[PDB]
């Protein structure tokens, strides 16, 4: 029943292995995020070697049907390498990894390694991940080829089999930083052939395994970087087959686009005659057009007329509330011709992930993106890009519609020059004002981050960056800092904006560093009255 993490903080391998098998894989999970005290005790080189030896002989005896103990043991072993990476106090001696490779081989060579089934899939998942976590990607290319060859609809029925076998592609990805692997990968013609066939299996399209086919396509495209190798004609032959068999937009385009993403990074699009696919993709994927007004155009993938209307109506609303709150006088900053805005809305975050990168040139591991372009250019039309979501705001249900729209208004009326122009950090303001103008006082997560005990000073908020993408600090605490100033010192907000509206970034920074000294006490008390009321 209950996890007892202290049992793992021990010098006895027997007590350690008793804790693994008796607490099971779900308690061993705690070791990933445990204190450096527990990690250092549990993941000594002695423990790893002894656990690996016992794991090797239990795996030799495996007779199918799954194993909670093996699952927990290989989970432990791969947790050690995780801790070895993140914990400086932890470095494995040279004789550990050969023993871990002994434990993995024992499972690989067991007659049941390629068994089908959900319980088996659970252990298999941990073994395949360990191949990656232990830097052994060079040792199992023939295992990858076997799994790619043997996969079929019967394996596909089990979630844990899909999840486990998908780990071969993470292994091919991880091999890039494995000098044995990159020394070997150029001769693996059988593996390349099996990757081609796996991705080209049309029965995976629109199935629960399509995502595996897309991963196979991606990993294949990475192999185009070995331009001289024995595998190079077959890699090229495989990529050509994928691009010609699947559409860039339609059923299976995740496979097409998966290949395109990596193949373009390591070779040129002209080899496969796919240069400039993004334009036809933009027209096919964003095939609806709705003209809100002469200043806002929507291009969308699949929205209803009612969503279009509610989106137009909501943006017109935010515009007038923005201009009143920011005291713009409707006067844009200088050298900004961004009178017209183009709004691009995909059907879902999945579609955004597939399509927005190529069409717009952006990262898509986020909730949306605003692209100001160059306001000084006559004919510049900025774009924000977003996706429909069930949890978005009715009646449009476009995730971050109001948020991105305020980015456009902020960029045109508060922030001189294009996006990269400032020479000081403006993240707290840009994101804070985008949240505050669009949510005003409805922000439960902002209240929550006050009540949970972890807080930020004004000084820390102003020095916030996108590094690590700390959503709490960026969006919640940016929101609080902005809201606090508009409520308690809106006249100081205008003094700041006099600077930002003229590009005077050093004066802007001197102004808000003054705030971080004057108003910290007032801000601290204010966040408390917010968490109380
Ligand atoms: Ca380390
Ligand atoms: Ca829709
Ligand atoms: Ca601007
Ligand atoms: Ca917090
Ligand atoms: Zn934003």
What residues form the annotated binding site for Ca(2+)?
84, 87, 90, 302, 347, 372, 388, 411, 415, 417, 449, 452, 454
User: Are 30 and 3 in contact, with CB atoms under 8 Å apart?
Assistant: yes
Report DSSP letters for 382-406, one per residue. Answer: -EEEEEE-TTS-TTTTEETHHHHHH
Give the whole-angstrom CA distance, residue 138 versus residue 130: 13
Phi and psi at 346, nearest 5°, equal -85, 165
Cα-based distances in Å from 305 to 298, 311, 312, 506: 11, 10, 11, 46
Among the bound ligands, name the one nearest to the CA of residue 531. 4
- Token output for 380: 């510049």
Q: 495: which 2 tokens?
A: 């003094």
Whole-number Å distance, alpha carbon 344 to ligand 5 midpoint, is: 15
- What is the rounded CA–CA span in Å between residue 24 and residue 7? 12
387 forms beta bridges with: 346, 399
SS3 call for 56:
helix
Say how many C-beta atoms besides its own lie within 10 A of residue 281's C-beta.
21
Read off the tokens for 226.
């070995």
**Greatest C-alpha distance within the chain:** 78
Q: Which residues contact 194 (CB under 8 A, 6 or more apart)?
A: 144, 145, 148, 149
Q: Is residue 205 a contact partner of residue 213, using CB atoms and an 8 Å limit? A: yes
In this structure, how many other beta carbons lie within 10 angstroms of the beta carbon of residue 433?
28
What is the torsional sign of CA 345, 347, 353, 358? negative
Q: Which two tokens stand for residue 397?
A: 């249900």
Binding site as annotated, residues for Zn(2+): 403, 407, 431
Chain centre to alpha carbon of residue 481: 27
CA of residue 260 to ligand 3 center, whole Å: 33
Counted residue by residue, the chain has a size of: 533
Tell me the two tokens of residue 474: 């960026």
User: Nearest to residue 388, comparing CAs of 303, 463, 316?
Assistant: 303
Ligand nearest to the CA of 88: 1
Q: Which fold has domain 422-533?
A: Neutral Protease; domain 2 (1.10.390)
- Say whether 422-533 and 276-410 share the same fold: no
Domain coordinates of the chain in residue numbers?
Answer: 1-134, 138-274, 276-410, 422-533
What's the CA gap between 350 and 258, in Å, rounded? 13
Which residue, 452, 509, 532, 515, is CA-closest to 481?
Answer: 515
430, 404 contact by CB (below 8 A) = no
Closest by alpha carbon to 25, among 62, 66, 58, 81?
66
Q: How many CB atoms lie within 10 A of CB 183?
A: 10
Residue 411 alpha carbon to ligand 3 centre in Å: 4
Instruction: Please give the distance of CA 506 from its chain centroid, rounded to a whole number.
Output: 34
Per the annotation, where are the binding residues? 84, 87, 90, 302, 347, 372, 388, 403, 407, 411, 415, 417, 431, 449, 452, 454
**DSSP secondary structure, 201-243, as one string:** -GGGTTSTTHHHHHHHHHHHHHGGG-TTSTTHHHHHHHHHHHH
Q: Tell how far the Cα of 251 is from the centroid of ligand 2, in angstroms.
A: 17
Query: Would you identify the CATH topology of the domain 276-410?
Result: Glutaredoxin (3.40.30)
Quick one: which ligand is closest to 433's CA? 5
Sequence positions preceding breaks in the chain, C–N over 2.5 Å: none
Are the C-beta atoms of 470 and 420 separated by less than 8 Å? no
Whole-angstrom CA distances from 454 to 449, 513, 520 are: 7, 22, 16
Experimental method: X-ray
d(CA 189, CA 168): 16
Cα–Cα distance measured from residue 249 to residue 287, given in angstroms and rounded to the nearest whole number: 12
Residue 220 near residue 259 (C-beta atoms within 8 A): yes
Phi/psi at 308 (5° precision): -50, -50
328 DSSP 8-state letter: -
Asked if residues 479 and 464 have their Cβ atoms less than 8 Å apart, the reply is no
Q: How far apart are CA 435 and CA 457, in angstroms?
A: 19
Helix, strand, or coil (residue 296): strand
How far apart are alpha carbons 333 and 172 in whole angstroms?
A: 50
- Joined together, the tokens standing for residue 334 give 């200088």
Please state, in angstroms and rounded to a whole number, the distance separating the CA atoms of residues 386 and 399.
Answer: 6
The residues assigned a catalytic role are: 404
DSSP code for 463: T
């Amino acid at each position: 029943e209950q996890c007892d993490l202290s049992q793992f903080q021990t010098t006895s391998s027997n007590q350690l292995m008793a804790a693994i098998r008796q607490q099971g894989a779900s308690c061993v999970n705690a070791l990933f995020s445990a204190d450096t005290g527990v990690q250092e005790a549990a993941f000594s080189s002695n423990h790893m070697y002894n656990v690996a030896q016992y794991t090797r002989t239990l795996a030799q005896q495996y007779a199918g049907g799954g194993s909670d103990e093996l699952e927990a043991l290989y989970l432990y072993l791969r947790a050690g390498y995780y801790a070895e990476f993140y914990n400086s106090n932890i470095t494995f001696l040279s004789w550990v990894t050969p023993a871990v490779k002994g434990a993995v081989d024992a499972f690989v060579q067991n007659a049941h390694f390629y068994d089908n089934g959900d319980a088996h899939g659970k252990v298999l998942n941990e073994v395949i991940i360990t191949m990656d976590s232990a830097g052994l990607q060079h040792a199992y290319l023939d295992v990858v080829t076997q799994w790619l060859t043997r996969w079929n609809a019967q394996y596909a029925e089990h979630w844990y089999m899909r999840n486990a076998v998908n780990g071969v592609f993470t292994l091919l990805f991880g091999g890039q930083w494995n000098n044995q692997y990159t020394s070997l990968i150029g001769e693996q013609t059988a593996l390349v052939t099996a990757l081609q066939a796996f991705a080209l299996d049309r029965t995976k399209v629109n199935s629960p395994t399509e995502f595996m086919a897309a991963n196979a396509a991606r990993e294949l495209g990475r192999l185009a970087r070995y331009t001289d190798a024995t595998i190079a004609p077959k890699v090229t032959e495989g990529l050509t087959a994928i691009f010609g068999q699947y559409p860039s937009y339609g059923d299976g385009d995740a496979i097409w686009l998966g290949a395109a993403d990596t193949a373009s990074y390591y070779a040129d699009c002209s080899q496969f005659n796919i240069c400039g696919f993004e334009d036809a993709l933009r027209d096919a994927a964003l095939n609806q057009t709705f003209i809100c007004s002469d200043t806002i155009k929507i291009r969308s993938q699949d929205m209803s007329q009612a969503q279009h209307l509610a989106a137009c109506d909501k943006m017109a609303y935010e515009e007038s509330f923005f201009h009143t709150t920011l005291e713009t006088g409707n006067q844009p900053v200088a050298d900004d011709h961004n009178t017209q805005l183009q709004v691009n809305i995909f059907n879902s975050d999945t579609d955004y992930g597939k399509y927005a990168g190529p069409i717009f040139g952006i990262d898509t591991n986020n909730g949306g993106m605003y692209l100001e372009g160059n306001p000084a250019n006559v004919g510049n039309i900025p774009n924000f890009i977003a996706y429909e979501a069930s949890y978005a705001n009715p009646d449009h249900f476009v995730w971050n519609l109001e948020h991105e729209y305020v980015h456009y208004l902020d960029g045109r009326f508060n922030m001189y020059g294009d996006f990269g122009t400032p020479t000081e950090l403006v993240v707290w303001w840009s994101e804070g004002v985008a949240e505050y103008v669009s949510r005003v006082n409805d922000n439960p997560q902002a209240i929550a981050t006050i009540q949970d005990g972890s807080t930020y000073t004004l000084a820390q908020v102003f020095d916030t960056t996108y590094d690590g993408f700390d959503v709490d600090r960026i969006y919640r605490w940016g929101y609080l800092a902005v809201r606090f100033m508009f409520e308690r010192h809106p006249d100081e907000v205008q003094r700041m904006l006099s600077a930002t509206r003229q590009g005077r970034w050093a004066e802007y920074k001197a102004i808000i560093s003054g705030w971080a000294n004057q108003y910290q006490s007032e801000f601290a008390q204010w966040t408390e009255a917010l968490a109380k009321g």
